[PDB]
Each structure stands twice: as C-alpha cells, then as structure tokens.
Amino acid sequence: GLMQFTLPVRLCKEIELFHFDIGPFENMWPGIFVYMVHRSCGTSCFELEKLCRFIMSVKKNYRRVPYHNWKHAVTVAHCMYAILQNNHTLFTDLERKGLLIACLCHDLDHRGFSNSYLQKFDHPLAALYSTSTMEQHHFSQTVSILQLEGHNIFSTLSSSEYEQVLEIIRKAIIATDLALYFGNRKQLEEMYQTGSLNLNNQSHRDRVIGLMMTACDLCSVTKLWPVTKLTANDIYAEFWAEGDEMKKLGIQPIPMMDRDKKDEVPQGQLGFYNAVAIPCYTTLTQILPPTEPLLKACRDNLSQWEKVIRGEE
Ligand SMILES: Cc1nc2ccccc2nc1CCc1nc(-c2ccccc2)cn1-c1ccccc1
Ligand SMILES: [Mg+2]
Ligand SMILES: [Zn+2]
C-alpha cells in the first residue's frame, strides 16, 4: 500500500521521455513496468501480488525470438506510458488500466513469423483466425493468463467495467495488425481535416487508440539513432529467417525477407518511414499535440537513413 517502486535517478528522469531505452538488464524490466502502472494509473489500480504474478506469466509466454520478444513488449508499454502521461486528462480510468496491459500483452507467444507465412504454411492458427491471425492469438493468450488462479488483476472491477476493459484490450491488440493501420489512419486524417473528429464518439476513440497502438508498436523509429539502427538488425533477423522458410516452402519471398537483398535495407527503411512511420506520428501529433517529440525523433531517423544511402555512414 505505502510501497512505491523507485528507479535510479537517470532512469527516474529519462523514463518520462518518449526516446527512453529500457536497457539490457532484463531483471529490471518488471520493476520498470510496475513503476509505469503506478504513476499513470495509481498504486491502487492493481493488487501488487496479482500484478507481479501476471507480469511474470506474460514474460514466460514471450519466446526467445530476435525482435518480437519480452523487451519489445516492455518497450511498446513504455511508449504508451509516455503518451498517457503527456495527455493526462484525455483518457478514462479504465483506458489507463487497459492500454499498458494491452501493450505488455500485444505480441504474446509470437513465433517471429508474419500472418502471411502462417497462411502459406497452413498453420492451425490460420484456420482458427482468417484475418489478423497472430493478433487474435495474442488476445487469446491474454485472456488465458488473466484466468489463471491469482492472475486476475481486474477482479475489483464490476462485471460491465470488466467487459469494457477486455474490449479496450481486444481492439488495442487487433489494431497492432499493420494491415489495418492504413485505413484507420486515412479515416482519422479525413475526420480531423473535415473537423468531424469527436472524442465522445466511442467509435472515434477506438480509432485514436488504434493509432496510439501503431505509434507504440513502431516506436523503434523514435529512439536515438544507435538504438534505431541496432533494433533494425533484430527486425531483419526475423524477416530473413521467414524468407528462408518461404524458400523452404518453394516460394521466392518478397525482397524485405530475402537476406540475399540485405544491400537494399536503407531504401526499404526510407519507404517505411515515408509510407508508414511519418504518416503515423503526423496524424497522432494532429490529434494529440504533446506526442510531437515522436514525430520529431522519427524525422531525425529518416534523415539518418538518408545519410546511410549517401554513404556518409
Ligand atoms: C516492416 C518493418 N517494420 C519496422 C518496424 C519498426 C522499425 C523498422 C521496421 N522496418 C520494417 C521493414 C521496412 C521495409 N524494409 C523493406 C526492404 C528491405 C530490404 C530489401 C527490400 C525491402 C521494405 N520495407 C517496407 C517499405 C514500405 C512499407 C512496408 C515495408
Ligand atoms: Mg504484433
Ligand atoms: Zn509488436
């Protein structure tokens, strides 16, 4: 009750910034997450004992893959922490509770392969869920862990508040399917520009939380350049193994997944910043002005990839 989590001074100050990197000490990541729930939600949001047991069951259900791992989960939750803390009064008590958990759980039991690879392989998950295949799995793992004994962190909510929070989590996790992001951002663009965007309209809020989910999920492009650059190695290490597996099914993969085309990574990153990242943080900044540092950091990293192409590194 009177038991705060507290971080060393450098972490206590830098964790509040969007570009914070959670560091290589895995054993500190649970404490970092609890610190974030406590400050963004309250010391009363979750029973410490259940929250600690839930965090460790979530950790155990992330796999040892290069990129879609436990560090990614805590990293995406920290980006959400930064958004919520810079937009204090815009979010409900339930949204605060739900979104950090959603972020922590959003890639539960990821195998390092895309929805497309699961469909070409004819993985059982692709017959159980025909679209957003991994994301419906991630939500399914979240509910499994919430129903283990001593793991129900939402036990103090009413039956209707409980259903509302699980519904925020489901929509937030589904939204991390990048195939869905393009249309969600186009709609948000049009609504913001014709002045129809209405944060009391539940279907509008849903869209805004979806875009926040994309922004947190892609937040590697908003780090300091050496963090961005080293993360990109992990990202391609997964895509290239997927490419290897496509070649084993007798299918030439797309060039993004073909390790034989490493040389094109810099040009690929430009496409991605221009087509996905920049548009994402631009619309987010329009809707939530205090998230502008994410857009500024993204643009700095685009300028760094332009330098790579010009052989200035
Ligand atoms: C998905 C992705 N997600 C990321 C998430 C966070 C940070 C970095 C990320 N990088 C990528 C790869 C971004 C890319 N590389 C390529 C690529 C690379 C090498 C050879 C050929 C193509 C294309 N494209 C791409 C372009 C436009 C739209 C979509 C993908
Ligand atoms: Mg995912
Ligand atoms: Zn993710």
In the chain, domain spans: 28-310
Amino acid at 7: L
Pocket-testing residue among 272, 276, 280, 304, ligand 1, by greatest number of atoms within 8 A of Cβ? 272
Of 19, 38, 68, 137, which one is the catalytic site residue? 68
Instruction: Specify the experimental method.
Output: X-ray
CATH topology of domain 28-310: Catalytic domain of cyclic nucleotide phosphodiesterase 4b2b (1.10.1300)
217 marked ligand binding residue:
yes
68 marked ligand binding residue:
yes
- Tokens standing for residue 303: 């300028």
Amino acid at 170: R
Is 68 considered catalytic here?
yes
The residues, ordered by sequence, that sit 6+ positions from 220 with a Cβ below 8 Å of its Cβ are 75, 227, 228, 231, 232, 235
* CB 138 within 8 Å of CB 110: yes
Instruction: Give the residue carrying structure tokens 């040009």.
Output: 267
**Residues lining ligand 1, Cβ inside 6 A:** 218, 220-221, 232, 235, 255-256, 261, 264-265, 268-269, 271-272, 275-276
The residues, ordered by sequence, that sit 6+ positions from 207 with a Cβ below 8 Å of its Cβ are 184, 187, 188, 191
CA of 221 to the centre of ligand 3 (A): 13
Nearest atom (ligand 1) to Cα of 228: 7
Residue 123's alpha-carbon distances to 68, 112, 130, 143, 202, in angstroms, are 19, 14, 11, 21, 35
CA of 69 to the centre of ligand 1 (A): 18
Angle at the Cα of 49 from the Cα atoms of 47 and 52, rounded to 5 degrees: 105
CA of residue 102 relative to chain centroid, distance: 9
Query: How far is the first Cα of the chain from the last one, in angstroms, to the nearest whole number?
Result: 51
| DSSP 8-state assignment for residue 91 | S
